[PDB]
Amino acid sequence: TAPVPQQTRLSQPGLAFLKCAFAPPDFNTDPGKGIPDRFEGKVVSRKDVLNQSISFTAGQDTFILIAPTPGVAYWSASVPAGTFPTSATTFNPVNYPGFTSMFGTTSTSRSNQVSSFRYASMNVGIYPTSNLMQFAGSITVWKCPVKLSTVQFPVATDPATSSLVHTLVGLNGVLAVGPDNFSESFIKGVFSQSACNEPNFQFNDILQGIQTLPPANVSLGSTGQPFTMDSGAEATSGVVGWGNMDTIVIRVSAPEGAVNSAILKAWSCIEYRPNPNAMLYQFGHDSPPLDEVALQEYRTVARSLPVAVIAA
Amino acid sequence: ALTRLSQPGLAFLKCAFAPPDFNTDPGKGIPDRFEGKVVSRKDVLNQSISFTAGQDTFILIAPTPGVAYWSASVPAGTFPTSATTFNPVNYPGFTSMFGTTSTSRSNQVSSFRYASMNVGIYPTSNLMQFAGSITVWKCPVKLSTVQFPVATDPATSSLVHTLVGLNGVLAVGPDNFSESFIKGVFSQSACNEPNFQFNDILQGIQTLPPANVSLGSTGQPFTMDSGAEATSGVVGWGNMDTIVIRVSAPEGAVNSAILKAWSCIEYRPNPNAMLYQFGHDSPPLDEVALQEYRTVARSLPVAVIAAQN
Amino acid sequence: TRLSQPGLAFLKCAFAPPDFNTDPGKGIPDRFEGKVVSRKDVLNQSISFTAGQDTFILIAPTPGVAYWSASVPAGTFPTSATTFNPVNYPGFTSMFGTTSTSRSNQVSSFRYASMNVGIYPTSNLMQFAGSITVWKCPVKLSTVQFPVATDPATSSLVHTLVGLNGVLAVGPDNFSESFIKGVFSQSACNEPNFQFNDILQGIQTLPPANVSLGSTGQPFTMDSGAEATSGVVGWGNMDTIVIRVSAPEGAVNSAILKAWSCIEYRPNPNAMLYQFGHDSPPLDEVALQEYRTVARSLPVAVIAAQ
Amino acid sequence: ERVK
Amino acid sequence: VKSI
Amino acid sequence: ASMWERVKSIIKSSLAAA
RNA sequence: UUUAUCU
Predict the structure, then answer these.
(1) Cis ω for the linkage preceding B209 (within 30 of 0)
(2) Residue B67: phi, psi to the nearest 5?
(3) Of A308, B8, C235, C295, most Cβ neighbours within 10 A?
(4) Is B142–A110 a contact, with Cβ atoms under 8 angstroms apart?
(5) Where found (chain E)?
(6) Interchain CB distance below 8 Å, B202 and C144
(7) Closest CA relative to residue A241, chosen from A70, A43, A65
(8) Following DSSP, what letter does each residue of B269-302 receive, concatenated?
(9) How far apart are CA B113 and CA B196, in angstroms?
(10) What SS3 class is residue C72?
(11) Strand G: which nucleotides have any atom within 7 A of a protein Cβ?
(12) Closest CA to C206 of C196, C219, C193
């Protein structure tokens, strides 16, 4: 047979940028030109800070989380003590101050102020205002690899069809208490930060029309999602985009007969591609030049930082 | 300086910033960390145009493969209304690579990655009756979807593609170049992403919003007509800041001009695609090329005079 | 120069047969260092070919699935009528539940390290016949929109595969060789940098039920089967592998088939597997350039026994 | 060589 | 913070 | 000044500046 | 020995 023939001095912006990620809101740290993104494009960064003083319904384990989604500080859900989220329970939005100004009133006009937003950091803080003998319970936190996916299914109709919509995945890791977490006496408060989900700092496009999730007309069973998401009034609040950030998960157990009152800080630095028309467009400067020192520092800090830390 | 860069990463740079100057620029493709067979084809479109007098005609350079630009005419002193519709102007040979039906787009090739966007404008009027002005700014437009519920039996909420950063088009952007028609203008666009990624081809998209969909239901300010599915069509959305150009034509004006387009672009061939014969693997990464592309993109004016192309 | 051991173990599972390399490698040496979990997947199985029929096999970046096979009559290419069935790596059902809406519970996103496949013929000198040829199709997962006439009339969108077409005709360049000499092949990254692909809910067949094949544009159907047995989890950024296998009718073609791909997933905190996960290894410039260089270097495929 |  |  | 010179000008300018 | 670059 015949064989065949086959023919130490990181740029100052990564100094101000790195400080955006793990520097408290009391340091009054500035957003900086942006990220030492390979990209040099035009962008306007903004540091979102929100202070919320609140009380916890006793005997109720209130579960809160930080949203990699722009415009909302966190989501609140509540349930019986010792219980976890359920298909019946729904989450309530709690947007950042001045939300309405950048996304407007209609779910469809979310897009005009800016095309896309890329996350910088996502931090949260808890401070207890409870006296010593009136307080009770514990705080517990773990992060979740929640990404925005899409589910496809066929619903009979004449003519019949297979409409498919967005569905969040990784919500199943939201019921059970994460293996790597921080748990402490409610009173000792707690502080935590979130890191980039991907190695690339790509710009996540802004979306429109999404108010609820599962979206209306869809069974929570046909979506696979463990529970529901209250978009809330479209004009008051909405979800525009999903950031490539690990979502944080905090729950506070309020034993029976205990009053727990504490303040809540939540901030995050972000970069958005300003609309030519937008007012905000005039503050924008260019994404600082790519610096290798700070880009590697940002990552070395992510793995070194503990899940959560004491309030003090 | 210029002796530091790899040779493949240079034909790549000329194709990107100064495509007009070297009559021929095949290019060796992108010196991306990624090396795989791919075909680097540079698009050139020459078009002579006559402008309606008394009307600002708007033009759009978007990173859509096969189609160099979009245009619509609107009364002078005004900007595009929701009722205004845009029409495309394919690049020579569109039909050939993307078939005839919106169902045929993907057969010729699977994905793409934009290198450069280059536009030229050359005044072709007499100096005596020409009148008006050319204005330009770049709009950071990206492509995404919007889900809204619909009542059918049983009722469901269909989800479809929509465009963001759209309305930025109506108002004259803060960062812009403005000059008398006669001087014309040249300008280009750079990648709006940190890294260069491969965007997939999209099928069945003659127009946005698509049929059976009400505008505004999309939130988009105006409509985009690809037209006949056979004649023209929409393939994908590159990570390129789309360029916008307004031409003010005061009434009684005699303004015409030649237009040229340089889109250095890379695709990936399908074995059944006969084009595959000329595919050469993405040239190995060259760190300085990437520094220069980024560096100079950032150092360039939004636009420049025509005589200084 | 000198590189680290995690960036070397990664190079080894990706480019060394599964004979030499026993460990999947702590992870991929990239910027990312978040909690991930590596699992080298090996599917061992002996199969005989339908006689007189040409069988086509595809190795796609679909997690939990080794390949997709179907048979057509001799010398013919896949037609609209033909459909592919997948073969699951062991314990697939164990991490992607039983229903399509149950893929997201164990994990939330992923990306492929490498994708390798092999063939060791069993037939004896007097019984074996035919040829096996191979080419790689750059297949991506897109989406296609179109009008639909209902009341009210609307336009729904549905996922679809592009680059699907390259499979009908054999690649300009390929590995054409006698069935008796067997073959070894590998697939590499399809993107410049490694990106995580989200999981995919409710996808069992493509075109999805209620969808005409004509409107989808792709040449042939794909069925996962019962939600319980198999399913289509995701689509990785890797060129896909195509393989024709001629089986002359008066012949006996036996052979063993190994297919293993190392890969990384993002464990869900709830997940009973979250505990084995370790943080992604630090950036390694030496190993990345070497991974890319060996990719361009390796041939379409090599003869087996080599 | 190719194995190491 | 600022360890190494 | 032509375009390949507003290009090659910031090339020997940024490559020399470092 | 032969046939696209850099000052």
Answers:
(1) yes
(2) -115, 110
(3) A308
(4) no
(5) Virion
(6) yes
(7) A70
(8) E-TTSGGGGG--PPPPP-HHHHHHHHHHHHHS-S
(9) 7
(10) strand
(11) 4-7
(12) C219
Q: Encoding tokens for residue C107?
A: 């994990």
Best mutation target among E1, E2, E3, E4 (most A Cβ atoms within 10 Å) is E1
CA nearest C72: which of C204, C196, C246, C222? C246
User: What's the resolution in A?
Assistant: 3.6
E3 inside 8 A of chain A by CB: yes
Q: What is the DSSP letter of A107?
A: G
| Residue to substitute from F2, F5, F7, F9, interface B, most B β-carbons within 10 A | F7
Distance of B2 CA from G4 C1′ (whole Å): 16
B162 phi/psi in degrees, rounded to 5: -150, 170
For residue E2, how many other CB atoms are within 10 A of its CB?
Answer: 8
Q: Are A268 and A260 in contact (CB under 8 A)?
A: no
For residue B214, give the DSSP letter.
-
Closest nucleotide relative to residue B24's CA, C1' based: G4
Pairing of strands B142-147, B159-164: antiparallel
C-alpha distance from C91 to closest chain B C-alpha (Å): 32
Tell the residue number behind the tokens 């496809």, with chain if given. A152
CB contact (8 A) between residue A200 and residue C210: no
Task: Find the nucleotide nearest B25 (Cα to C1′).
Answer: G4
Q: Which residues pair with B144 in a beta bridge?
A: B162
Which helix (H) or strand (E) element contains residue C305?
Answer: none
Measured from the Cβ of residue A230, the count of other Cβ atoms closer than 10 Å reads: 16
Residue type, C134: V
In terms of phi and psi (left: phi > 0; alpha: psi -120 to 50; beta: otherwise), the region of C63 is beta
Residue of chain B whose alpha carbon sits nearest to that of A222: B156
Q: List the structure tokens of C231.
A: 């399913």
Q: How far apart are CA A226 and CA A215, in angstroms?
A: 14
**Encoding tokens for residue C22?**
């026993």
Give the separation between CA B179 and CA B132, rounded to whole angstroms: 9
Given the residues C19, C23, C41, C198, the one annotated as active site: C19
Does the beta carbon of C16 lie under 8 angstroms from any beta carbon of chain B? no
Which technique was the structure solved with, according to the deposited record?
A: X-ray
Q: Provide the Cα torsion C212, C216, C221, C227; round to 10°.
A: -80
CATH code at A1-312 = 2.60.120.20
Q: Which chain B positions have a beta carbon within 8 Å of C147's beta carbon?
A: 210-212
The CATH code of the domain at B1-309 is 2.60.120.20
User: SS3 for A23?
Assistant: coil
Query: DSSP letters along C28-42, please?
Result: --SS--SEEEE--EE
- Please choose, from the candidates B244, A147, A265, the residue with its C-alpha nearest in 3D space to the C-alpha of residue C103: A147
10 Å Cβ neighbour count for C278?
12
What DSSP string describes A255-300? -TT---EEEEEEEEEEEEEE-SSSSGGGT-EE-----HHHHHHHHH
Residue C164 identity? L
Which token pair is A34? 């942006």
Q: Report whether CATH 2.60.120.20 matches the domain C1-306.
A: yes
User: Could you tell me the residue ranges of all domains in chain B?
Assistant: 1-309
Distance, Å, B23 CA → G2 C1': 27
CA B192-B198-B203 angle, to 5 degrees, is 105
Residue C19 annotated to the active site = yes
